[PDB]
């Protein structure tokens, strides 16, 4: 039966999104309770971005330099501070639509929904993964800065990403909601290489389990492997090494299908060595690595 990349319903995040302007920079902010989180680079001129001293630049700013707009309503800023690379604007009104929420740092290879916003206005929702090299293959246009990534955990919106910037390859870099960058990136105009963008092996394995659950079985072989010997082949193909803990999180899907993790590892080994021979798995011609084991469990019953 049918298998699709899916985002979390966004309604709870839509009612947290605002416009923030400082001089001639407009980007998005996240209004939770009476605090507006946005990227601190909002305070910079193009000249400042060459070697910003954010402490010095922010001290020179006052509350009234920050224009917040929640719809066509203008929010009164009664305080401006800095936590790492996120500006916090304190405001005179607590967000009526403030949901139950939490701030979480995600692991490389974990997935999350992006609510892509323009001028404080929700435009689109898509599912993506934190790449091994801590970049996001996002869809972001100018004014997409301050757009947030999240998971919904039972009732609880878990915010995990804020968009800050784009690297020369068109990949996206950003912070958790404590303002620490994912990866070795800095909010200033200097050369900044992402690492090698490896494939998230544990996610491919989940997806092959998805494929089995949905009646795609052609790539199943009779072979087996050790975790060491699988990782030898993985290393050669720019795949992340599989850890015992990866095997552990795959356990539920191993159980549901009856296919041991290392047997599924043996199937993947063979696809890597031989390709697909112009065949597809769940409609793809490439191995998909943006579904976690939990993603597949969630969707597949």
């Amino acid at each position: 039966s049918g298998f699709r990349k899916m985002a979390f319903p966004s309604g709870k995040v839509e009612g947290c999104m605002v416009q923030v302007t400082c001089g001639t920079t407009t980007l998005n902010g996240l209004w939770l309770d009476d605090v507006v989180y946005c990227p601190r680079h909002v305070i910079c001129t193009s000249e400042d971005m060459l070697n910003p001293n954010y402490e010095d630049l922010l001290i020179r700013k006052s509350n009234h330099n920050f224009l917040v707009q929640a719809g066509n309503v203008q929010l009164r800023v009664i305080g401006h501070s800095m936590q790492n690379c996120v500006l916090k604007l304190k405001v005179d009104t607590a967000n009526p639509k403030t949901p139950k929420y939490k701030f979480v740092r995600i692991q490389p290879g974990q997935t999350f929904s992006v609510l892509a916003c323009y001028n404080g206005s929700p435009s689109g929702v898509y599912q993506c993964a934190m790449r091994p090299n801590f970049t996001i293959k996002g869809s972001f246009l100018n004014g997409s800065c301050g757009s947030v990534g999240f998971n919904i955990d039972y009732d609880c919106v878990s915010f995990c990403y804020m968009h800050h910037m784009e690297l020369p390859t068109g990949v996206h870099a950003g912070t958790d909601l404590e303002g620490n960058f994912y990866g070795p990136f800095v909010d200033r105009q200097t050369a900044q290489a992402a690492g090698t963008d490896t494939t998230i092996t544990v996610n491919v394995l989940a997806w092959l389990y998805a494929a089995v659950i949905n009646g795609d079985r052609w790539f199943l072989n009779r072979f087996t492997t050790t975790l060491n010997d699988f990782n030898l082949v993985a290393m050669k193909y720019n795949y992340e090494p599989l850890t015992q803990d990866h095997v552990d999180i795959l356990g539920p899907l191993s159980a549901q299908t009856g296919i041991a993790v290392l047997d599924m590892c043996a199937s993947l080994k063979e696809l890597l060595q031989n390709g697909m021979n112009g065949r597809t798995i769940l409609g793809s011609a490439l191995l998909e690595d943006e579904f976690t084991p939990f993603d597949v469990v969630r969707q597949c019953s």
Partner: peptide
């Protein structure tokens, strides 16, 4: 980099 490119911001915004």
């Amino acid at each position: 980099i490119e911001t915004d």
